[PDB]
Every structure is written in structure tokens, then in C-alpha cells.
Design a protein around this ligand. Sequence first.
Ligand code: MG
Lengths: 37, 85, 1324, 554
Amino acid sequence: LPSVEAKQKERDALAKAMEEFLSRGGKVQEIEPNVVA
Amino acid sequence: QTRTIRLPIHVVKELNVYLRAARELTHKLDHEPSPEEIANLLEKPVAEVKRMLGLNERVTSVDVSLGPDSDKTLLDTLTDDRPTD
Amino acid sequence: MAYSYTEKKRIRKDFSKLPDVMDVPYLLAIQLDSYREFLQAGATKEQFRDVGLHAAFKSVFPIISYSGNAALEYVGYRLGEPAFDVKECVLRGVTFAVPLRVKVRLIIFDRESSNKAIKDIKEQEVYMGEIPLMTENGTFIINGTERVIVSQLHRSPGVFFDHDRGKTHSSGKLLYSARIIPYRGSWLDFEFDPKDCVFVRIDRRRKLPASVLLRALGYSTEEILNAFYATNVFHIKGETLNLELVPQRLRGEVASIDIKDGSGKVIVEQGRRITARHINQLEKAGVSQLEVPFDYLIGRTIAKAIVHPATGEIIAECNTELTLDLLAKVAKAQVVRIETLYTNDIDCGPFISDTLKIDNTSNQLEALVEIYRMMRPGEPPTKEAAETLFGNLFFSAERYDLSAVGRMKFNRRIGRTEIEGPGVLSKEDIIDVLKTLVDIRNGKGIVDDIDHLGNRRVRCVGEMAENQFRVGLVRVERAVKERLSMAESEGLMPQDLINAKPVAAAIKEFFGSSQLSQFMDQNNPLSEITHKRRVSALGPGGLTRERAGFEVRDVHPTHYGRVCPIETPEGPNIGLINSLATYARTNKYGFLESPYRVVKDSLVTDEIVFLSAIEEADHVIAQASATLNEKGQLVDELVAVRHLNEFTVKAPEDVTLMDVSPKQVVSVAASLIPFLEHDDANRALMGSNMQRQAVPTLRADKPLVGTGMERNVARDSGVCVVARRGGVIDSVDASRVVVRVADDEVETGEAGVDIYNLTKYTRSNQNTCINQRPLVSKGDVVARGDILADGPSTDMGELALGQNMRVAFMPWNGFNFEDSICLSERVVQEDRFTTIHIQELTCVARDTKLGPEEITADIPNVGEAALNKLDEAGIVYVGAEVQAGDILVGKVTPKGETQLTPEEKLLRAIFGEKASDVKDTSLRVPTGTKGTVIDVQVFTRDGVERDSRALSIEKMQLDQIRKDLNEEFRIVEGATFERLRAALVGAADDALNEQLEKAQAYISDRRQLLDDKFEDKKRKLQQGDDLAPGVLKIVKVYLAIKRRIQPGDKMAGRHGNKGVVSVIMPVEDMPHDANGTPVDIVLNPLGVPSRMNVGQILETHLGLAAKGLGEKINRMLEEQRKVAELRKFLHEIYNEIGGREENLDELGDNEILALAKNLRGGVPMATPVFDGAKEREIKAMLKLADLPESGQMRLFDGRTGNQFERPTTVGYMYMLKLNHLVDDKMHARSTGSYSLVTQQPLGGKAQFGGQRFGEMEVWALEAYGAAYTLQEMLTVKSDDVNGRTKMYKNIVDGDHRMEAGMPESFNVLIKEIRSLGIDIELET
Amino acid sequence: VPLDGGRFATSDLNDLYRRVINRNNRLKRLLDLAAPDIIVRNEKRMLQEAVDALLDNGRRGRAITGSNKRPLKSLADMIKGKQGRFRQNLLGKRVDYSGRSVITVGPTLRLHQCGLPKKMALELFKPFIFGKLEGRGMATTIKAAKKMVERELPEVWDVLAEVIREHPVLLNRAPTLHRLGIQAFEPVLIEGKAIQLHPLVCAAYNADFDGDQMAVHVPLTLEAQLEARALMMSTNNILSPANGEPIIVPSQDVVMGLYYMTREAINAKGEGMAFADLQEVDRAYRSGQASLHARVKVRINEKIKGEDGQLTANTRIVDTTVGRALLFQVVPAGLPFDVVNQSMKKKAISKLINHCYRVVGLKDTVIFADQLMYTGFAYSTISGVSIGVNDFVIPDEKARIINAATDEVKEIESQYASGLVTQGEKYNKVIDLWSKANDEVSKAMMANLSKEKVVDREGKEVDQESFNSMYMMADSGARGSAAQIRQLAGMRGLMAKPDGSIIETPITANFREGLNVLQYFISTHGARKGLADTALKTANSGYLTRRLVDVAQD
Ligand SMILES: [Mg+2]
């Protein structure tokens, strides 16, 4: 199954991607929980 | 040719509207299907929506094993009201 | 030692002789620890890396969207608070669930081979699936009813080797198939062909060749075959006459060619068995080349491809034998090298060398097509395309489920080095299966065992719930993958991206529609414990009942300390349903472990290690009852050991481990049997099951002869309330107990008050009574862990499942013929075995298409005698005695088109009753059941109209909450008056007034919480209960019935002696002694020699001494004896016979007199299972209470007055009342309702059907001459419309001959055969 | 048929019949439109599998499966598949005038009668009461007579007592293995809810009092009432249908009172006195001036049936005990006195009932087997026999055999470490050694258990038979055998293994002294092996007796 390591290598690629964005020009949005769009 | 009890073509056309409108409302945002909140989206009275949803026959089968063990049937446990003791 | 508050009231005489190093741990640790790992409530920002709820989100969420530039990233999840509490959830029908809000962000990309220009949008998503959030006792409140989820004992993933020799091979030596069992799906197999070959297979495929699987993976056929059996190279200087002498292969092989090597001497004659002396000559000789013949190399095939340097091409392919025509080519080509295979019959046969020529699959290109022939022959995939296709099909991680424990068991069995193997198969593991499967044929090693505890894994609720949550997540991603790819992030929100329906539906069916989640039987605190320690081998994805056989339903030498061998249910599943041991504990991988004591040759160490099943065969394990020299040394030359799963006897210099306690082998229910070593294993198995079916009596009575584990079952079951913190009890009420927390055990800076609400008479899952009674007083101090109020069937913290009766063993006029019990009238007048049963009766109001159903107070065709018990709403009052046939609630249904018979309307005009168009469908009690209405619950829709009684019950609930809040503030108000006054009188005016603002700030902040709590309960009372669609109102009542003991009820003991009471004789008829004390129960002594259970009599002998000592204490206490004489007699009982106790620690005037008052009825004694009292210690207490050491006295007959001519064994035995009463066993029927198609009797009208007349009873009548009795029971008693109605008229008329007619089972058979186009008629 | 809440429920044949009509009418309309052969050949093909799926399912035509797990239930599936209407009725059928309840021993009942509760008799015999109330004049209509039974009027009990006087009822246990599983009894009204069963018919029914239930049945027609009295009565089937031996014999509780009564003692109270008749023996015993078993001489008047048609009486003076003379009072006239001069074991009583059946007949035997049950229950209560902790006597020479056999194995284990014997040679040496010591303890235990009772006759130490409770229950054949007393007093021996081998270390302890933790775990191997074997004994033997009936039924 996809239990543990089936998609582990993909997480490191996405984690490193957000690190470059959060360094310069990185913003975080506090979206409300109950939002339709 | 779908249901057991045949519905006329004049009441079966408007029945698909209540079933199509109920599908979009249940998936709005973590919503549960119910006949109370659908009466406002279609501007239908409370007594009218209970008759349209209840018009669906959805007949069951008596030759089905009730429970995990396949040793008893539903037809073998039914009784009659016309014949007496 | 120091005694707590509960232990000072009554002390049990312990006959234990072995010291205890470790006490019994928490019994329900397997249900609580497995759920905390899955549901991590208390955690920091950094979660754990377990396989629970966090691993599911960490494996399904982080996936990019195909044909798009979006991806979902999982950040974390948080657990909220439940809407309702624990106790207020079983009455409303809620699931006591808790929501979880997982924070998942959505990322966007540009699909430019680089993750740039992203926009993270973190949004706390709504609850996906509400977790049931099991309680602190290990139960899941699902839809109001608490359930347990038993653990599953499934097979561990890995490889398994065995013999499997049967009728298929028609011989003794046979080769088994190594069937690799993954975690889920993608099964494999490897079967060895009988003709020195190997034929692998699949879960559904036929026999596949093993030669094509070697060259398709990338390995060469020449190198893989040379490294399988052996490899030998020979040099040839123009003539191929040489043999590489192997010191290992030449040993044990005869040489048919005479050799003259040795510079003038002979080594081996013509066809002679070489000896070890001549074999060792070749080592010190140093020779390697020898003159070999040409006719002896024709059998030895070649290993690798031989290439000649003169010709330039492969002169001989791999796996080719030598022939006569192939010998002249070597002399002409003059090859410098030669490689042949040296195989023999004494060693392992080269099965891989012979199977390499099968189907002509040796090359790399020809082997890749043979595999595709078995997977998909003639498919759309090409020859080379299917090779790359199949290479990635079974290599998929999601397809080939291989857990971490399965990878460990895979490498450990084959002998690999890397224990934590990867989830995918490796090329280094495929070579170990070949060398291990062919080795099991010649018998050069050992095989595996599929029934050992090392191959079986325990799966708890934490893994079964995480697997269902994982399936629910993969069902969400498959539906939200197409929605995210065809859309963007700026047009929607992360909430609308995925759906939460499949997750909530996956966990809804696991707790409500799974065979593992079953209703907990709470008719006994012991049944609740054994239901949670239960390990079932059945269930989904496991071994079922039909495929069990006999090899799994037995015990194994590895079950010592992990699974109880005398706790299997007798019936269709015996040996499949097991129970965990007392000291057993699961390992990290899921294997069962048991504690042991490391013992050395000089000192038994104090450290305790928990050993698994596979780690047990290395060490030497001795018994726990081994003799010691008061210094840690064994004093026996011959000790009992089980080092290699063999119960043998060895020396004390070879022991390495020691057991902790003799009770670690038996389970909890099996350890509560005193003198277990004297009972047979068949009776002990039945005694532990009947002890589980005991009904809580009206008065709880402790057993005079116990074990000591009774104070651990009642504490770990949770039926009794224990003190969370220590302090002084403030006030004791019959419904609640409030304690004042001590000054030292307070976490915050206030006083602190704990309030415990006691559970009053409530209904159990088995329709029994459950209530708690206070045990503390006003003004006594308690510590953390003391029992404040005992639960059902508990006596002062102990376990009281039954009562101890005066038993005499003798035949009494045949009333105790085989197993019947001759009872007295004293046990009925004293209300000994009387029990309370609570029954629930519900009445629902639906919405008929003609008209709705409403609860009213007007019933047609009734009188005043039936409406006086109801009220203005239509429901009976609480506390009204209802007989059989009374009306509970009023309910009428509108009817239309009745079509009344004209002969009926003439009769209604006789009296003058008006015609009402309403059918009477009121809720009434069944026939034969009477009780008292103790509680009425009313449920209605949210916003629906409520009757007058709905608000009346609401007003009572709103006041009991208000009375509790006023009591909470009243006790804390007095603490503010004594603390402020003590500091004002004792020892600056500004500092005195400054502390008043802080004291009043706490009483004002608590007052604000009381208003929030009061408005919370008021809001919950107004919330309408959600029910099934189509129901308007639900009214349920509760009836309480007190069932006494009557002839027919089933009684039993703790030693497997069950019976049914036959008669209740008066007191004057029971046998009495010289003093005139009559017995209570007369048992038959003929059962003891048949079923060997001597502990049944040893309990009777020890029970006589326990009651005899209580009579001396009572006589000593009534004569106003001094305290110095009481503690002297108590020291003679506890500190003189055996075991070990301690006195002179309690006050004589207050705590010793209170102890002697609890021993007035009898002195309780503790007898462990294998560390109990002997025959000498039992007779030592018989002579202490002025009783005969033989345990037998001469009795007198109550009816004739004559004395019996033989001494009779008397004493007190603990009896139990089982849940097999005759009130639900006696049935009778004359007529009734019949079915629709087949006119056969059936139930459904508050009455059962009939007795099924099977074929075995037909053969009994056919064996007789009863032809009219057989025809009557087949035609006129069933399946006859004109037969039953005309026979009933005959019985009333007076005469009765027969009415045969024709059965309806045959009339329907004719109409069904005719509908198949087959004509069938009666020729007559 | 509809259900609760307006929901309907149909069968699996309505949608099958509807599917054929939907395709048959579609084919009839496709023929008048002059449709080509390309489109009409596919519609005629659909009509094939439409009717084929209606007749039977599982063939090459896959059955329809819509919104359901099970495939379907066609016409042929109603008469086949282990659930057909023809096979479901052959294995069972509910009947009227029946009921069930637990069983209970009644020691005061006769052989031809049983106990029936009042609450069950009112329901089983309900139609017979309605016809008796109208014939007597207590009720005018059947509607008024039914209301009298619901109120339980006192005059209804007088009517119920008359409708069951000569009306037999049938009792049967759930496992009906042989013919004696169904027997007819005359029901009597008892207070309670449990069916009072006769103690002697418990052997044929194979029924114990552990909560077992027994079904009842009421024969309606007088043709079935005569078959229950002349064929299915309990007094008619007194012999087994498989052998010639009586099946209704005194059980363990009755044979225990008849063995203690006829058990000669050496010296007792009232030994050597003479009695003029059997009535003086009872008169001397009831006064307490004579022991139950003392050597006396009583003059007896007996009759001999050995002569053809001549019942000649003979008066002789015999030398017997007091208990054997009291037992001869219930013996019929056709039997001599030499039949009660023995110790009256279980094998001796069954041979007396068989000999009594061939001499005096059946009427004098059904009243003689009831007298043995009354005499056995009476004299087993006077003697308060009981099992205690001192009844399992241990031979003093058991320690001299266990300690000697343990030293004979220590000298062999030294030879195993020296290379003299092999693994297989040592296995057969220690297995045959403990088997010899187990038989040596058993023969030394029975010698000390049977001849331990000593007495004094005018000054002496004479050894007689042991009057021990554990010895009497095994000697009389009531309960227990040599293999069970061996495990209580003597050593248990060597235990088996589910694999089929014998463990080297035996169980040298008994159940009186107690077992160790390892000795108790070894005994659990053969315990669950025998318990799990019973599940196959009821599944394999039941399949054998069913195949034997299907062949020899005609
Ligand atoms: Mg039984």
C-alpha cells in the first residue's frame, strides 16, 4: 500500500520548493475555515 | 423499465428535479442530506416535499439473508393479515 | 506492612509461599496503549512517526495532480472536544465522537520543470471523520451501546518452509511450496517439481518455469547456475585430462578409475570407497592436477560457456553434457580452459541446472517473453514492452503490500543482514529462496512452523482503525484528483477541493458493521475483563472456522505465558478464540511477550526482561517454584527446564531465566479458581466459562475461599469508583459522594473539591441491574486509589460473583440424581439468589401516508380499568405495578376503507359503542412478564410538538443540575471563610485587604463557569434528538423484575460443576448436625470420581474452617472480651499457620474492633492457583476452630430423625447463579400466525413459533410403527389450510379421525415444476 | 407485500418475469416495422438469455446483478442449492401443539408417567378444553370459553385434569440418535416451569441435568393416541433395539444403594441371629437392633418358575445377610433367592432385569424396575456416603518406586553423554521404564485400597473388603473406572502430544497432591485434543448414519 515510503520522496521535493518561496516574497494567507470559494 | 411499480410520464419528469437538486445541496460544504433544508432551495412547502421524496418506491427483495449468517430468509419470517388463525 | 483505608477493614489470609517480584500490571493495557498510539491527543507541534492517524495523512495527502500544476500538502491535525459527556451519551443515542480539523494547504506551480511561483493557502478544513474516542475502560460507545473491538491473531508476513508430505507425492520425502504471504494482495508462490525441478506459480496462475525468471531480471544464466551448486575450472594443454581436486567434494564420492598419483603409489583402487585417512593425504601432498579418464567426464555437465581462443566462437554452450562425438572436438580445437560442473548424489542435486533447459529459456531476450506468457498471453503488450511492463507491475508499492514487520520476518528467515528491508523486493533476496527451498528436500537443516507464536502476530484496535482510515483516504483522493486538475486555486478553496464523505463512511462501518466490533457482555465485571483480553483468530482477512481443522485448535509449547490453554470456548470454535495471559504483553512488532527473571549460578538478578517467542529457544527457562538458599541460589540438583520447548530436567548450572509467578500461565478467569492444580484441565476449562456467566445477586457476598486476584479484577474493570486524589470525605449520599481534597495534593493554588456521582439502577447489555453503593463515611481520610463505592457484584473492593452456602455431599432420596441440586427453603426466604433484571420497551410513532401517529389517551373498545394507570399525556406513571397485558403508552392509527361486516355492526348496536376510525396499536407488555416502571424517556424531533410529559421530565432534569451547582459553590464558599479567618486572627492592614481581592477573584471566576455550565445543560435539553427519517416520536420505558430462584434454574461452582435445582425442600427435611444447624445445598458425591476435580472438596474443607473461625470471633466479640485477647487470637490465625501477614499496626480500640466485626461472618482466605495451601495447612485450621481434621461429621436425617450410619462431608462452598433461568426457556403453542408462502407456524405476535420436526425425529417414528402419528405431524399440524381449520373444529365437536388433504409444501412444488416447462400431474 | 412505513418488498422472480416481457414486446414491435436482419437477430438473441436467466442461474448466461451482492434467485434455485423448497422441508418443519422446557429429575414418578407444568398443559391442550367446557355446560359458545382460560378460573383446572388423564404426550431430546429418542409418557400436573423426567429413562435419552431441554408433542387423533400407548410407550421399549440387553437399568445413584445394602461384613451388630421370615428381618432392622449387613440365617418362602406351568413354592433356610433379605421382598415370585445373594454390582443387576423379563413377562417387570429405584434411592440416603480428602489414600510404597525409577534414568543419562546409547535407543529405554513403574504403582494402589478395612471378631485382626467411598463407587460400577482412580491416588503417568509422540518426563503426581505449573501445562495437550475431537465425532458419525438410512430405508 501507500502506507509509508510510497510517496516519501515527493514530500522532500515539495518541502524544498516552499523554502525558496518563503525566503523572499513569501506570504501566508489566513483563510477562514467555512469558505465556499 | 427501471422500477417495479410503474410511474406515469407526467409525475416521473418532475421527480428527477427533486433528486437532482438534492445532490448539489448535500455536497455544498460538509452538508448532510435532509428533506427540511431542501424545501427552501426549491421554494416547496413542507408537506409537498415529504410526498415527492416518499413517492419513490425503492422496493426491496424478500430472498435476502438477513444478518452475517446466510441461514434465514426474509420471506420465511413474514406473516399475512388476510388469513387468520 | 502499611495498610490503606480499604485494606484495614478486612484482611485475607494469604497462603502464598513464593515471594512476588512484580505485581500484576494493568489488565486493560492492551486496549488503552494501542489507541493512544493511533489517536494522539496529547502532543506538541512535532507529532510521532507511528502507524496511527498521523501516518494516514502523511501518505495520501502529499501528491501532485497529474496533467496539472497543483498539489495538496498536509501540515497537521487537531482534535476538538466531544459534544456530550460519557454518561449522558448512552441515553441520547450519540456516538461520543470527536471532530478532527486537518490543516491542509494547496500549492500551485507552472509546469516548467521547476517548482516556482507558488501560493500557499493554509486553511483549517472542516471535520472529515469523527473518531469514536473510546472511554477509559476500553469500550466504544457506538449509538448508545458500548462495544469492544477484540484483537485479531493473524499470520505474520514473510516466508514459510515446511514438509507438506501427503498423498500427492506418494512417498515419504516431499518438497513443500514456499508461499510468500504479503500484507495485502500480490501473493506469490514457489513450488518444487518432483522431477528435480522447480515450478513457481501465482495466486491464480498455473505452473510457471523458474528458469525464465532469472534471465529476465538482468542476471546471466551462466553465472547464476555456477553460483548455485558449485563451480570448477580445469585447464587443458591440448588434451582435456584434468580435474580440480576439491577437498570437500571428493570426500564421500567413490572413484571408479584407478589413479597412480603419489610418485609410485596408488591412492584409490578401481571402484573403492575413499576413507578419511586417504582423503587427508591430498592436503599435505600439495598436488592439484591428476590424470583423469575421458569416459568419466560424460556425466559432469559444463557450468559456464566455454570459448576457444583459436576458433573465436563458443564451442560449448552452458548446461551441456559431454558425448562421444563432442570429445574429438576438444582434441582438435585444443582449448586452454575448461569449465564443468561437479555434482554428486550424496550432496544436493542440481535442480537449477536441470531446470535451466526447460522451455528453452536461458537467454535474456527469450526469458522476458516466457514471463509475459503466464501474466498476459496474447495481450496488447509487445515482447520487449511486456518485460518493462511486468517489471513495474508487481514492483508497485501500492500493489505489493509489505509491512515493516513483514520485511523483518523476510530477511530473518532467509538469514540476510539488513533487518529493516525496503518495501520493494530486492535482487539479493531472490537468491536466498533458491538456496533455502532446495535444502529442505535433502534434510540438511530445520523447517519453519506456521503455528508457533513467532509466526502469529497480534493486531489490536489501533491498527484495525488506522487501516480503515487509510482506505477512506485513498477513496477521497481518487475523487478529488479530477476536480483539482481541471481547475485552479484562485477560483475555489481547499475546502471545496476534497470531500469528507468517504472518510466518515469508512469509519462508520468499522465500529457498527464489523465482526470484530461486537456488543460487550457486561452481565459481570469478570466478563468485561475477559472480553477485552480476548484474542480472536477469526475476522476479516484472517483464518475462518471452516478452514481451521485440527492443527490450529490445539496448544503449542510456545503458548507458555502468552495464551491461556484452558480458556477456549466449547462449541463450533474451540481453540480459535483465545484469551491473553495475566502478565502477557505485545511487542513493538505485534508479537506476544512474557516476563522472566535473569538467574545466574550465584545470584538470581532482580532485573526482569520481557522475552518474545523466537527469543525463548536460546535461553533456559525454569519454574517459578524452584527452591532457593535464601541467597539467590538453587538448592535442587534436578530442576525443571524448557530451554528448547521440551519439558525436560537439567542441572542448576545451565539455567539462565526464571518465571515471575506461577499465575502467569493462566488467564484472569482461570486464576480465580482456588485449588486449580487439583482440578482436571477439562473441568477447569468449564469452570472458567461458567464463572463468566454469573448473574449479580441482590446481596454481594465475598468468597470465604478465594485466590487474591479478586481485588485486581474489580479495580481494573472500572465498575467501582476509585479516588482520583487523596483527602477527607466531606459528605456521603446514596446517590453521590463528595470528598475534600487534602492540602498537599492540589495542583493549583486553591482548595479543590472532587465530586463522584454514583450510578443508580440502570440497564445493562444483558438486561441486568447495575448500581453502586457507597462504602465510605463522613469524616474519614482516603488516599489515591481507595474504593469509595463498590459496583455490581463486588463486596468491599473484592469480586463477589455468588454466595457461599453450607454444602453437604451425600445422596438425598435421588433428588440429586445426576447433577441436580437439592435446595432448601432458607436460601429462598433469605433472598440469596434473587436477581434484578431491567427490560427496555420502546414505542415509535411513524408517519403513515393516511395519517401521522400521535401519542394520545383515548383508546377504542377499552374500559376504565385499562386507562387509570395512564396520564393526561398517555404514558404510565413511574413506579406503577404493571401486570401481563397492561397498556404502557397510548397509540392509535387512522384507518380507511374498513368495510365492516354487516353481521358485526348488528353486535355493536347491542351495547351501543360508537364507530371510531382508529386502529388500536398501543404498546403493551408481553404475556407472562410483569414488573415496575422505573424510568420513562421521551424523544421527539427538533422543533416538533411536545406533549405534557415531555416538559415534566425536563423540569426534573433542570433541577438536579441546579442542585449540583449549588452544592459545588456551597463547599468552596466555606473554604473561603476558614482560610480568610485563620489568617486574620493569626498574625499591615493594606496587605490584609490586598489578598481579599485575589480570594474574591477566584470565587467570581468559578461563579461565571457555573452559569456557562448551567446554560450548556439547558441548551442540550432543548436540542432535538436526530432519528431515522420517517419517525415522529420515540417513547421507551424501563421495567424492573426481581426473579427469585425456582426449580429449573441452572447453578454452578468455580470447579466446573454445573447443575439444575430440582426441588426446594423445607428446613425440617434438610440434614442437620447435632447442634441443629441444617445444610443449604445437598450435592451428589458420585461426580467427583468421574470427573477428577479434587479442588471441589478441598474448597469445602477449607470453607468449613473459614466459617468456624468466624463463629469463634463472634462468640469472643459478644462476650465483651478485651482487646488484648482479640489481637492474640488474630495473631494465631494469620501469623501461625502459613504464608505471611502483619499485625500490631492498627489501633486496638478503633481499627482492630472494626476488623473483627468484618470477620464475624467468616475469615476470608487466599489460595493461589499453584501457590496455595496444602493438606496439612487445611487441617491446621480445622483443629483451630474446634472442628474435626477429617472434615467429616455425622449428620442426622431431618424426616426420620435417625442418624446417618456414615460420616458426611460438610462445609461452605461458593455457588454461582448462571443466566439460564426457566422464565425464558418454558415455551408452549397450540395455534398462531402462519407464514405467507409456506403455511408454517412462526412468531411475531408476542409469541414463539413451534418445534421443528427434523428428519432425525422422522426416522425415530419410522423405526416405530407409528404411521398415523407421523402423517399427523406432517399434514394436519403444518402446511394445510383445510386441514388445520377442520381439525380444530373436530376437537371441539368431540370426535377426531384424520384430515390428510395435501401439504402446501407439495402443492407449491407442483406449481414451480410446471413453470419450468415440465408437465407433472397425478395419474390416480 | 408491503412493509412498515409504506415500503414494499417483492421477490426475485418479478423482475425476471418483467425482463422477459420487456424484451418479448420489444421483439413483437420490431417485426412489423420491416426491420433488417442486422437488428432483429440481436433482439432474438437477447430473448434467449432473458428466459434462460429466469429458469436457472449459474450457466453460461450470467444472471442480472443490480444494486445487490448475491447474484439472483431464479426458478430452479427454489428447488436446489442446499436451500430449495423441496430439501428445506426434508430437514425440518414447524408443528403445532408443541413446546419445550428444561428437564428435572422426579424420583416419585412411575415409569409410564412424567411431569408437565400447569402453564404448558393449558396451552398444549387448549382445543380439548374448549370442547369439554361446551359438553359439560360451563360455556355456551367458543368465544366465551376462551375468555375463561385467560382468567384462569378455578373450574378450568378440574377440566384440564380430565382431558390429560389417559392422554399420552411425546418427549424427545434435540439429538435423536436412535429410536429411543422419542418416548410417550402420561403427563401429570406439577407446580413449576421444569419438565419432571423419570430417572431411569435418562440412559436411553442420553440426557443429563445441566440445563438440557426436551421438546413436547401432543397426539391429536385416537389413531395416534393408540400408537403412543401400544408402540411408543416408555414401558414398552424396555430393551434396546440393537441388542437383547435392557436399556432401562439402574444408574449410578440407584446401583450405589443396592450395592451398599448387599455388602456382607465380617463382624456387625446382630450377627448370627435367626429369623423366621423376611418380615422379621425388616422388623429387627427398623428397631436398630440389627445392622444392614450382618451374617444371619432367615427362612424364606420362594416360588420356582423353572417347571412348565407349575409355580411350586419351596421353604428353605438360607445363610445370607440382612440387606440381601430386604432386597428379596421386591423380587417377583418367579425368581429364586440365589439371584440376590451376590454383591449386586451394575453388571449383575442388568442381568437380573434381563432374566426377569424372560421369566415373569413385562407387567411384573415394569413394576419391579420401579421398586429397585425406590429401594436404591432409600438405602443410598440412609448411608451418608461422601468423598473426602482422606478417601484418596496414597500407598506408602509409592515414594520407593518413584525414587528408584528416577535413579535408573540418571544412570542412562550418563551413558548418553559417553556415547554408549543413541537418541532413539535412549528414547525407548526411558519410555518403557516409566510405563513399567506406572503399572507397579497402580497394582500397589489397588491392593492397599481394596483390602484395608480391618475388623475384630472375638479378638483378631482380620482383613476384609474395604468399606471406602472411593472404592465402592468404582467396584459397584456406578461411576469411575480403573483409569480414573489411578489419577486420583496413584501417579498420572506419561502424557501424549498432538503430534503423536510421548514426552520423556511423566506426571509423577496425582490430583490429590496437586500438579506443578509444567506438569499442568503438559496435561492441556491431551485435554483440548479430546475436546476438539468431539466436534468431529458429531459431524462424521452423523454423516454416516444419514448415508445408511438413504440405502436401507425401503
Ligand atoms: Mg447436559
